[PDB]
Write a protein that binds this ligand. Sequence first.
Ligand code: NA
Ligand code: NA
Ligand SMILES: [Zn+2]
Ligand SMILES: [Zn+2]
Lengths: 323, 605
Amino acid sequence: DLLAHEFNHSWNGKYRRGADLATPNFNVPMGDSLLWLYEGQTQFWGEVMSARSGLWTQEQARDMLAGVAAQYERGRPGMAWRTVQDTTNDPTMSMRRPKAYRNYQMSEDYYSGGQMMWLEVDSKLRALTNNKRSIDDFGKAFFGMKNGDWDVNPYTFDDIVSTLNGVAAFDWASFLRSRMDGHGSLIGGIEANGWKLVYNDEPNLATKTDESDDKDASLTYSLGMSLKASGDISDVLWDGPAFNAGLITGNTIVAVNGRAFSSDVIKDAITAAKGTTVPIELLVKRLDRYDTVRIDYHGGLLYPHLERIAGKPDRLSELYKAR
Amino acid sequence: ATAAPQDVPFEGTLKIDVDATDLQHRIFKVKTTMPATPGPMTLLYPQWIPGNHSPTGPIDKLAGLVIKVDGKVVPWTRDQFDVYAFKVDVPQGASELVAEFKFLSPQASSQGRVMMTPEMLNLQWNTTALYPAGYFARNIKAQASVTLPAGWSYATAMETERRVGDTVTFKPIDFDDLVDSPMFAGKYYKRVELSAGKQPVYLNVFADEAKSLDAKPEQIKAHAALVQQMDKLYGARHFDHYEFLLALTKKLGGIGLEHHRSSENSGAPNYFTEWDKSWTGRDLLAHEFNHSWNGKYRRGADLATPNFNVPMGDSLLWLYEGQTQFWGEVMSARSGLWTQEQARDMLAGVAAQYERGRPGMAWRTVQDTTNDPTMSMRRPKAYRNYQMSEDYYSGGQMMWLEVDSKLRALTNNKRSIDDFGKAFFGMKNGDWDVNPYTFDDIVSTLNGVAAFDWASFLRSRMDGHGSLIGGIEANGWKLVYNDEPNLATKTDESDDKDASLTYSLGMSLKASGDISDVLWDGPAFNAGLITGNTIVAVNGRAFSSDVIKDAITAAKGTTVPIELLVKRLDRYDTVRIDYHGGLLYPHLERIAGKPDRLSELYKAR
Ligand code: NA
Ligand code: NA
Ligand SMILES: [Zn+2]
Ligand SMILES: [Zn+2]
């Protein structure tokens, strides 16, 4: 999706840019307040255009989308105190330097969190117009002027609202602020467009590809952590089971129920603990000390997928379909 | 299935020509030439090698064998019931047989000890020889030659006839003495005189790097003192000259092999340059030198076989190796190769090995361990402490210490084991032909020093299951254990940060935590631990030698078991060891009331 993503920026980001971002030279500070359009909708179009162009299969794009939806339904506990709007300050705050909890500190969520909101914007435009308008109409109206022009054409927040209102009348200012300044769910566009985010033990296509050769283990929605093949913990979900055992990134899972760690071993132990009352025993190395923790997790392996809601119209497939 | 060797004359000379230039492949190319007698002929590759007491002949490393009679190839047939025997048919009217082959020396330690390096090589003529069946080996006149890597020096007890370029031709010699006359060769060589006179002794040092050859005067003196101290003991030398062969190396395979007029010895590159760190192995040259008397000159009758392809009887190895192990350590102290404190702590370690480190003594005798060379071939065994392993060495050493103490008690300290050595090995100065003995000869010579039922004494120790360390207390000392480290153990575990815990937790460990040895019926054994398991943590803390030792001390006198996190194959478990005795290392302490005969024994004469 990279080339689709970067290409879309020629319209969204380069040609049209937030007025506080379009600075007069390279040595005055940049205002990032509208990055949830610049990068957020480009993240959205990058994945949609990957499916429309055939760079991704339709199944690949849908599993990609399921991972994003799960990230904000369960993988971002930092939503409770921080808004997506505040993450537009992350480039200057963090400069992508290592942080302990991307899931709790949050990290440039104007990308994927913005993508979810633009998916909901598409679903709302369809609902307001009986599917006669969609986010495609916003794209043409907001970026389709002045063919050949590649000088910056700045915009403000009110311009976004006005263009959205021109596609379909609605209090878009309140809608945008409620998602971007709020702490609530961002994934409403999934169900509105006819699908549902579910979790089961079948691996997500994206996660499966990203953990095949290295034999890593992404267990975000089960044990609340990710591990390298060595057993080194690479990420811990805030308030998750691994977190509640005091585990941090850099600790090592040495053994699972007494058996030397492997990705298959810890996954099999999670499956074996599903529905039982026998805790999973993890032998842990913390710096130069070893201890055993008992984790009472019995939900089994949980990987995100999208499933159809049979009665509802399938607007999502229309959105991801080639034009 | 090979006809017995006969004490009949062998007509002619067996010529053995070796090309030792292929250092890269580590190949010795060989040409053996002999008179060809018409009719069936059987050629033998040496199988039982003197000094190894076992069939160590590397038959599967003999390759490329082609046999020609007067230039014509003759097919050979190996005896399927004697794989060291090659049979050919020699036509009528033939004159000369030539066998050509290659000895493919070890390319890694897994094939045996390495014999060739870019800087040095070790030529053992039994690996590069074929000889006719049916003859006593001593009746076969032989003449050897070797082509060396360009410009290399060499050393051997065998007299040189001529060196032409890099081809050294040696003077004719009996075939059994040829096998007994190994050669070291290398580019970094130093020859040091240890004793002048009519039966001179020299030390030949080869090294990986020339800097290792810088032996200091006081260090050479200790080696010269070894020769003088052996003169005091035996009063005779069983050689016309003696050539120590010493390789200071990390590349050549380790070796300690005795011969009549030489010995093959290996040491670390810091044998001289770090004299204070390399002391634990310095009894080697004293050990091998003593064998020139005890083992080479005098040998058990069942061990002195007529050729290299009939089995050897090892029944009397507790004199061959046992008393040599004894004199090796005693002479190290007498000569100054070891300090008296180092020799005393070495002896304490041996005594503890048989007081507490050999539970296998409950079922097996030291006499039975004389079969270990052929049973085990020094291959890995799980419990050297319970299966036992060649205890005719150190167990024999303790008996000879008790023999010494008994000789003193019987004679009011006027006689000691020194008198046995002179009486049993000191005859016929200059003779280096084998002078065999039997068990009755040992008893008779001991009885000549001091009358006693030595037959019962020897049999009760070597066929018994009781204590072997009685000579310690009889000679005025007592074996004790405390938390003070043994000098040998400390030196042999330092730098690597290893951990010898035989007398506390009953196990030894590498710095990694891998268990390297487990004492039968000890605390680690009783937790189900075996060699190859890994101690991962101690009381929850990542393993180190210091960590486990501090935990042993912390567990002393308490009832809180030591918690060891253990890796067994792919499984982790925690064991609790209820050991509360603390760290225990063996030492010798004086018995105030008794005379100190031990210091007399270890004192220079
Ligand atoms: Na421009
Ligand atoms: Na001889
Ligand atoms: Zn971008
Ligand atoms: Zn020996």
